[PDB]
Amino acid sequence: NRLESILSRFDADWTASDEARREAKNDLFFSRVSQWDDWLSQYT
Amino acid sequence: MQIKTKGDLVRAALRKLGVASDATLTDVEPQSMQDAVDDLEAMMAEWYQDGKGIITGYVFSDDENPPAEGDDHGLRSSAVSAVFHNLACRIAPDYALEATAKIIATAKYGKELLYKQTAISRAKRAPYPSRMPTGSGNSFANLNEWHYFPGEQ
Amino acid sequence: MQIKTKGDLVRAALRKLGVASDATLTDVEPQSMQDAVDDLEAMMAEWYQDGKGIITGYVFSDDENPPAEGDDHGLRSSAVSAVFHNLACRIAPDYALEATAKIIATAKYGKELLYKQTAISRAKRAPYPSRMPTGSGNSFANLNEWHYFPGEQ
């Protein structure tokens, strides 16, 4: 019951701020690690 | 179309060359028909190049049926006026005759019209190169970590 | 294809020149057929240049079986219309005849179509030179200490 409420609140908070998190993570990876964001569909 | 059979194409080519028709009293001799149908089969085999060449409706006889003159051809109605003109142009060296310039011009026009539709259909542009970014305007593939184009693969 | 054997090629060439065919009252003596098939073998061995020239399905007689005129050839159906046309163009000097311009044009077209596919297949681009770094975007070959391209080797 308590765990269910905590997880529901956490899921709402996580899903409500997905695009900003993804864009910030992409910015961090582009600025720090490398500038070729082609990990997917590479090695061909 | 009245030119359903290969023998009709052979007779039309011979008549255009003037070798055998009814406007001239001569009649077709069977060995001439056999030679002309063999030449037709060889020429049509040369044009197709196993697909990589000119594509027209045509059925190649497996020689299971001995007489290949009577069987049907799959030529569409537009290709007929070119096939027998080219056949008549090719047969002329068998005798000492030379094809009239009108026949040569008609054969040129016919082959051009045969290949124009396939030329239009095969003019396609290559996909984006592999190392080509997708700009920030897509807004969906950019959010799906799908930043770069796949490639020619 | 009804032109299976080499003798069929020789007879087709002779018919195209008009020297002799099935519907003629005089024919050619077999020694001339032997000479023509020898000439065909010589011409076809000069186009192959030992695998480095025009590549077409063709089997050379091993001379163990006596008659090289009777055995089959491995020519695909598309190359037949070129081989016997070129053979007929080459044979005419043996007699007093001269090949008609139509036969010359057909031989040119046939040889061009014979070599176009191999020309497409043989147009390959060389690898990167030995002293060419791989940029920092690969992220795997760069981390495997393999910074530079291997070379043509």
Automatic annotation (TrEMBL), chain A:
Superkingdom of the organism of origin: Bacteria
Supply the name of the protein.
Portal protein
- Report the portion of the entire protein shown: 6 to 49 of 725
TrEMBL record, chains B, C:
Q: Name one Pfam family in it.
A: P22_Tail-4
Name of the molecule in the record: P22 tail accessory factor
Source organism: Salmonella typhimurium
